[PDB]
Design an enzyme around this catalytic site. Structure first.
Site, PDB file in Angstrom:
ATOM      1  N   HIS A  41       0.823  -1.203   0.000  1.00 25.65           N
ATOM      2  CA  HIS A  41       0.000   0.000   0.000  1.00 25.65           C
ATOM      3  C   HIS A  41       0.863   1.262   0.000  1.00 25.65           C
ATOM      4  CE1 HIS A  41       0.028  -0.116   4.648  1.00 25.65           C
ATOM      5  NE2 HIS A  41       0.495   1.082   4.346  1.00 25.65           N
ATOM      6  N   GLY A 142       3.078   6.187  10.472  1.00 25.45           N
ATOM      7  CA  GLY A 142       4.509   6.116  10.236  1.00 25.45           C
ATOM      8  C   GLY A 142       5.200   4.838  10.682  1.00 25.45           C
ATOM      9  N   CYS A 144       4.031   1.870   9.882  1.00 24.43           N
ATOM     10  CA  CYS A 144       3.636   0.852   8.921  1.00 24.43           C
ATOM     11  C   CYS A 144       4.888   0.132   8.430  1.00 24.43           C
ATOM     12  CB  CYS A 144       2.914   1.494   7.733  1.00 24.43           C
ATOM     13  SG  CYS A 144       1.384   2.364   8.153  1.00 24.43           S
TER      14      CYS A 144
END
Lengths: 299, 6, 300
Positions: A41, A142, A144
């Site tokens: 993503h 942040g 991720c």
């Protein structure tokens, strides 16, 4: 003595974390060998709307990527999908690639999360896989791509990569095979977690830990057979207690057999009456029996 | 009770 | 994502942990430069009864030490006490010695524990220093010598070395100058901890964490001056508030001023009843403002 959620050292993992950015997205990636794995993503041009991953991959331009470690950049040579993961081939091999393996975590099992912020290791802590395939971790915008790992028998296992947070605050991620735990979709959708089933063996462990600490207000003068308990659990969102073998040591040390604790669970399930167990106001199923035994006494 | 030198 | 206790990466400290044994004692040590520091009772003939440290030191034979990182065994050229710690000179400089400094932790401050079992790093977790100089950690036989550290703006500080467990379960350690936190003696004696004083800073931080998480049933919209709070604090085992400057950002994000939380504290101290905050049944003072500002915004 004392029960605290712990994590295994992160030294072997820290050198593998890299910053990966594309467009307006900045997250973390895992650099092993000449490859960098991260949530796909990170490729989305608009995360507030449904994502067409086929289109995003078609319009991808390698030069738009920015992979780096300690401000030293790695050139991306190619990009491909592997389930919900993005695999980038880079022009350089990670000289600090630790010997490792990949495996999936199961419900009730514990592992470590190395929480990172924009390619930078920030914190380490232990978590526990919930029945729906999520975890109660702590990630903010942040983190991720943060990595989940476990050290077992001198072998490092990479088991989880953070992808997203659900509306209910539960965290979703995938294994390195590109399969999302719980089968959740990697979309900014409003998918629901589902009914959470408590790990019975983990709660017993917790109660034992509480006993070792001197707390006994929850100990009754009753007992509930494994069979009866296993019957009740199936209808009250609790797993089935296969056997009491795992708690033998705890049973001998405290003097309370599993079945007595099983009785407590059923009776605590409706509220603690304002009381607490190890400071918590409800049953905790985040510690496995092994976790507790090791932390109680010499193991 | 008290101390243990761990 | 609620409020969970965390630890800073341990990669920098792992290469410094070594195994130190003398006779039948085995614990952890810290290898920096050509020195190895570890709890001194490792040379005690019997850590079960009262120890005469002068005598134990008088009868120590350097060659009876066993210091090893992994397969690398270090030669002890000299041994001396520095407070409750043993300072060993070794024949090799630790090639992985990170840039570092030393300092003491004050009450209410947090740091990380890198717990090791006989020279092997097993786990890392965060802790907070209590007013009596103790911490609520988890150490099992063999974790003595475990190391406490903090990373504050690029700087690695070594701040704690584990020594013993009080009768009540609280854990006691020392800084690297060799002073035991809380002034406890490294003896199997019977010393009491005393009444702990809750950190007001941290509890206010705790409540902001709650508000940020969506819990506000404890919000009173009624505020209590910092001055009135401090007077109440002295008689209820809580620290006096420095000021409210430490939470400026938290008060802005939530819209609740510190004075309002202070009023909440006083009332909440009488008990949560059958209610909880961040799933806890009472006030928690193990999280500092700085710690909470992260975990919620992660901007350091």
């Amino acid at each position: 003595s004392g029960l605290r959620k712990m994590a295994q050292p992160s030294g072997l993992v820290e050198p593998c974390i890299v910053r990966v950015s594309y467009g307006n997205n900045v997250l973390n990636g895992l650099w092993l060998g000449d490859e960098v794995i991260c949530p796909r993503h990170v490729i989305a041009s608009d995360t507030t709307r449904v994502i067409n991953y086929e289109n995003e991959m078609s319009s991808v331009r390698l030069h738009n990527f920015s992979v780096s470690k300690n401000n030293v950049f790695l050139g991306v040579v190619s990009a491909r999908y592997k389930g919900v993961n993005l695999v980038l081939k880079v022009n350089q091999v990670n000289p600090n690639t630790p010997e490792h393996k990949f495996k999936s975590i199961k419900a009730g099992e514990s592992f470590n999360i190395l929480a990172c912020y924009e390619g930078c290791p920030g914190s380490v802590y232990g978590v526990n896989m919930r029945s729906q395939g999520t975890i109660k971790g702590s990630f903010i915008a942040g983190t991720c791509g943060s990595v989940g790992y476990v050290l077992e028998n001198g072998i490092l296992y990479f088991v989880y990569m953070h992808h997203l947070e659900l509306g209910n605050g539960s965290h979703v991620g995938s294994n390195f095979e590109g399969e999302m735990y719980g089968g959740y979709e990697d979309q900014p959708s409003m998918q629901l977690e589902g009914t959470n089933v408590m790990s019975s063996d983990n709660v017993v462990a917790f109660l034992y830990a509480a006993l070792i600490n001197g707390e006994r207000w929850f100990v009754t003068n009753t007992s509930m057979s494994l069979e009866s308990y296993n019957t009740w659990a199936k209808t009250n969102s609790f797993t089935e207690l296969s056997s009491t073998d795992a708690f033998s040591m705890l049973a001998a040390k405290t003097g309370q057999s599993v079945e007595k604790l099983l009785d407590s669970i059923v009776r605590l399930n409706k509220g603690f009456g304002g009381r607490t167990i190890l400071s918590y106001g409800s049953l905790c199923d985040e510690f496995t029996p092994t976790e507790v035994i090791r932390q109680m006494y010499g193991v | 009770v008290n101390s243990t030198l761990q």
